[PDB]
Design a protein around this ligand. Structure first.
Ligand SMILES: CCNC(=O)Nc1nc(CO)c(-c2ccc[nH]2)s1
Length: 192
């Protein structure tokens, strides 16, 4: 019933992307990071996280990690599906990513799910145990949407990360570039 409406939401994001993210240029590419990063910042603001890490990985994957409570995994009654799937199958980032995955550390458990263009590739799966909580999202921007470039700009990321850390004092926000294995760069910001 409500799975029909999830599907149509994805078709709608993918047909008119600029209506959701501003554009499909370099600016909109970087806007995907901001959308993920802002959820981590809200978690810190609610009192539950103090560390966010943004990694530019090989092939221009992005990984965003925080140490908050973990996206919830409980079964929504009205979908029959785990909360984390419901939130992610209505995410613009996910819809505009050729691939994306999520790891959630919560309830001493590591849960995992993957998607392509917003569509789950399998049911949320328990994959491990943990004594931490938090959320990891890694995603690969869709080249079919972002036709100008899918290459991130370290200084573009760094300037905005430094400004977010300055504006949201008490959060440690760390940027790392790992695209070049032989020269890894990292800048780490933590005001008060
Ligand atoms: C890597 C990006 N991080 C991230 O999304 N963190 C988040 N944590 C929580 C736990 O409250 C989130 C939440 C979504 C709906 C309810 N809770 S969303």
């Amino acid at each position: 019933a409500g799975q029909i409406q999830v599907l149509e939401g994805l078709e709608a994001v993918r047909k008119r992307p600029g209506m959701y993210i501003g554009s499909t240029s370099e600016r909109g590419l970087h806007h995907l990071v901001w959308e993920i990063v802002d959820n981590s910042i809200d978690e810190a603001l609610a009192g539950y996280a103090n560390q966010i890490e943004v990694v530019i990985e090989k092939d221009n994957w992005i990984k965003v990690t925080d140490n908050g409570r973990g996206i919830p995994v409980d079964i929504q009654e009205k979908m029959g599906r785990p909360a984390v799937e419901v939130i992610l199958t209505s995410s613009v980032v996910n819809a505009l990513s050729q691939d994306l995955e999520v790891y959630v550390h919560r309830n001493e458990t590591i849960y995992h799910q993957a998607y392509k263009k917003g569509v789950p590739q399998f049911d949320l799966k328990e994959v491990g145990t943990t004594d931490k909580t938090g959320t990891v999202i890694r995603f690969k921007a869709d080249g079919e949407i972002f036709t100008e470039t899918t290459v991130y700009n370290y200084e573009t990321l760094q300037q905005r990360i430094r400004e977010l850390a300055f504006l949201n004092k008490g959060i440690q926000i760390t940027l790392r570039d790992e695209r070049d294995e032989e020269n890894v760069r990292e800048d780490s910001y933590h005001y008060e």
